[PDB]
């Protein structure tokens, strides 16, 4: 159905330690498939997925040339970012980047993003129309007016509408056994006591795909949030995601509580009990 | 595919 693709960059300056560190990874919906490390001896666009190894040497010779084009452009960019903000040369800062295309169930273009970020806060962005910029501060309108004289938006848009989408359907076809099949969550419930009458229930759901899920601890047909410990969804290591939701109960009422797991792989929302 | 990168 609906899928997406992202590309993440991370430039971090290290004064007194030589050239800064550039880290770039490539993401499909929830699966990383390429990576680049500026401090790696290979200096190539190494893969991080099985289905992507099919691409010939011309693919890796091209991706590598235009990700090293980025490390030298973003390092060049880091010095310019300092004198734009009049910061100290002996200081460390972080420059990030994110943009990719979102496709529908037919490979049809749906939305497009483009955002840079200097030290955790947004710097510049591309609007939804993919032809206009939105600078965050005055030091970014300096850059914004640079990418207005040069029609940068009409090239990035030509990428997201074009190269991004036309290339993404190639990835979905090359790995249809992995990226297109959604695993269901395996569910079960635990029980932990604390006091002589207070106990702690916990609803579990391990090993699913994708990450978007909702765990709901109800109580007699009415939802509950008081005394409901909830941790954010975490990865597993194989390509799946785990998530639990806890609740403290008194001894005697455990038969009243209920847990619900709403996900895609289950064509019915399960309703657990004790 | 990696995209084309520009400077500030």
């Amino acid at each position, epitope marked *: 159905g609906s899928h997406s693709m992202r590309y993440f960059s991370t430039s971090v300056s290290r004064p007194g330690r030589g050239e800064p560190r550039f880290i770039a990874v490539g993401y499909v919906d929830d699966t990383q498939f390429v990576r680049f490390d500026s401090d790696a001896a290979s200096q190539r666009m190494e893969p991080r997925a099985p289905w992507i190894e099919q691409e010939g040497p011309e693919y890796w010779d091209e991706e590598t*040339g235009k990700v090293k*084009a980025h490390s*030298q452009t973003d390092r060049e960019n880091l010095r310019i970012a300092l004198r734009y903000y009049n910061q100290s040369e002996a200081g460390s800062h972080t420059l990030q980047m994110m943009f990719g295309c979102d496709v529908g169930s037919d490979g049809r273009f749906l939305r497009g993003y483009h955002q840079y970020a200097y030290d955790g806060k947004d710097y510049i962005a591309l609007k939804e129309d993919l032809r206009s910029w939105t600078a965050a501060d005055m030091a970014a309108q300096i850059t914004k007016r640079k990418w207005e004289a040069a029609h940068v938006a009409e*090239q990035q848009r030509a*990428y997201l*509408e074009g*190269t991004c989408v036309d290339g993404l359907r190639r990835y979905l076809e090359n790995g249809k056994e992995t990226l297109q099949r959604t695993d269901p969550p395996k569910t079960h419930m635990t029980h932990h006591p604390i006091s002589d009458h207070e106990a702690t229930l916990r609803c579990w759901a391990l090993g699913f795909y994708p990450a978007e899920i909702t765990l709901t601890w109800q109580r007699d047909g009415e939802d509950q949030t008081q005394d409901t410990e909830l941790v954010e969804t975490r990865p597993a290591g194989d390509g799946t995601f785990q998530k639990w939701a806890a609740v403290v109960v008194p001894s005697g009422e455990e038969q009243r509580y209920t847990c619900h797991v709403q996900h895609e792989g289950l064509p019915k929302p399960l309703t657990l009990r004790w | *595919r990696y*995209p084309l990168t520009f400077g500030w």
Partner: T-cell receptor
Amino acid sequence: QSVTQPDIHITVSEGASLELRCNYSYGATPYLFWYVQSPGQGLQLLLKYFSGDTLVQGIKGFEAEFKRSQSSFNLRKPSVHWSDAAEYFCAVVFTGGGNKLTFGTGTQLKVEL
Amino acid sequence: TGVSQDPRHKITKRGQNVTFRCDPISEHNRLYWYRQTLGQGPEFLTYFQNEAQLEKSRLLSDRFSAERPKGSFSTLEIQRTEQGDSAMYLCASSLRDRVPETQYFGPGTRLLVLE
């Protein structure tokens, strides 16, 4: 993917309508160029198009129209000169594949007086 | 304008080395190297952005040696020259901030190898 120059060799008289074709591979939105190489010296840029005005004018009186429906970027000159006798290459930048120039097969043009 | 090269023509016997020295235009931070065989299209060899190498046509060998150490000028070097390497080597520069990404070529360097 590749670019194609169908006109391999043309010989016309001085003052004739000229058109050299250069079609790209149906799917990309590349940068477009047209170069000329006299037999002795190097290349020389003539035109370019990515801004969004389909018809582009340039040096030596040459024009060009961009037709995404046909995926063509054709050279034109309503009246060819005798000095226009040289090889004519068209260059595209295959955008997602990088920034290296991808040249055509090479059109060699002679003019007759 | 414009891009410069030195020298323009030369010729050597196979077995020795050659070296060409290119000079692009002011404030241009990208430089490509191309080779054009006789009567054919220019083939892509290598391309720079700011003193560091980004790509090399894998259909080449390690005998070719290019470098742009000072950030402006580039120098090509070829070891173990052969007749199969005789062609015209053309320097080309760009700006990387022009969205059409215009590459401007120089007069080039024609070579010839014999026995």
